[PDB]
UniProtKB/TrEMBL annotation:
Protein name: HD-GYP domain-containing protein
Domain of life the protein comes from: Bacteria
Residue ranges of every copy of the HD-GYP domain listed in the record: 126-309
Organism phylogeny: Bacteria, Pseudomonadati, Bdellovibrionota, Bdellovibrionia, Bdellovibrionales
Species: Bdellovibrio bacteriovorus (strain ATCC 15356 / DSM 50701 / NCIMB 9529 / HD100)
Keywords from the named record: Metal-binding
Binding site for Fe(3+) 1: H151, H184, D185, N266
């Protein structure tokens, strides 16, 4: 009898108490999981981790409560005047960025959703740039379920920090870099590929499928008038390497410089998140197993960023 609407689980973050139930779908039935009054700050977030949760459901009659919950979370989290714990702010903002990316992946023709994601990417740059511990707090949020939207947020975070180290200050460029990084793996959306394995031990079939993703991703968006060219370039070129060994065979001179940055940042998170490489060993691995693929200055800066420098 009752109607439900879907919500993305990355929107359930921080210490605000929910004024709605939330349900997990099991065997196509809506099973009560989160109750009115629950919150998700600190260790409470574990209730939503390691469970491959993507969508949950709320009663349609409670949708207004959810919408107000989300808007309050976002407004409070981006506010630099509150003195709110940085980890809680980061929990909310990381999840909101992920939500915005998922909305674009699910609705790529939607101009408003793209523009919302773009505007929020600008807000994200400002959050990371204006709060000393923001990057560290975001990097504390492990990608337990190995999703491409969480991975996009992580890659965008490393990309913002890398851009700062390289002296790329133009706000339009940093916004588009962040947006492209967030969306970079659109080509993997609803792919049967298990990303959580090393590329060099994938079956030939899996590797072949993997090589298609930037090409397919870019082809899908390249003629959409509302997509920024830089974002299209990042989606399509982010697997390219400076010595021309990537899927498109591009060399550094052939590439959007911002895609070179995302390529480096991505290569690092792939090692750490998808291949189980300890963060302190990732730079070495790229240099010794990914010879000549990325600019040494990017790898050194990324190593420093992961070290807190
Ligand atoms: Fe990729
Ligand atoms: Fe990636």
């Amino acid at each position: 009898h009752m109607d439900y609407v879907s919500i993305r689980v990355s929107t359930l973050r921080g210490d605000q108490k929910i004024d709605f139930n939330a349900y997990v779908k099991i065997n196509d039935k809506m099973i009560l999981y989160l109750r009115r009054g629950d919150s998700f700050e600190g260790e409470r977030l574990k209730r939503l981790k390691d469970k491959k949760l993507r969508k949950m459901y709320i009663l349609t009659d409670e949708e207004n409560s959810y919408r107000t919950y989300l808007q309050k979370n976002i407004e409070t989290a981006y506010d630099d005047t509150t003195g709110k714990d940085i980890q809680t702010r980061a929990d909310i903002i990381q999840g909101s960025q992920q939500n915005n990316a998922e909305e674009v992946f699910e609705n790529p023709e939607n101009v408003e959703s793209y523009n919302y994601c773009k505007d929020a990417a600008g807000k994200y740059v400002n959050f990371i740039m204006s709060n000393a511990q923001a990057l560290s707090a975001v990097m504390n949020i492990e990608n337990t379920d190995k999703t491409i939207s969480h991975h996009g947020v992580t890659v965008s975070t490393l990309s913002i920090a890398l851009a700062q180290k390289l002296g790329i200050t133009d706000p339009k460029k940093t916004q588009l870099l962040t947006l492209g990084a967030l969306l970079h793996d659109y080509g993997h959306h609803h792919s049967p590929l298990n990303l959580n394995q090393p590329l060099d031990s994938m079956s030939p079939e899996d590797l072949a499928l993997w090589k298609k993703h930037p090409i397919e991703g870019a082809q899908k968006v390249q003629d959409k008038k509302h997509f920024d060219q830089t974002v299209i370039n990042i989606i399509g070129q982010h697997e390219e390497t400076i010595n021309g060994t990537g899927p498109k065979g591009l060399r550094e001179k052939d590439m959007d410089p911002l895609a070179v940055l995302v390529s480096s940042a991505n290569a690092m998170d792939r090692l750490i998140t998808f291949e189980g490489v300890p963060k302190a060993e990732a730079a070495k691995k790229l240099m010794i197993d990914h010879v000549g693929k990325h600019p040494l200055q990017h790898i050194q800066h990324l190593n420093d960023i992961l070290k807190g420098l």
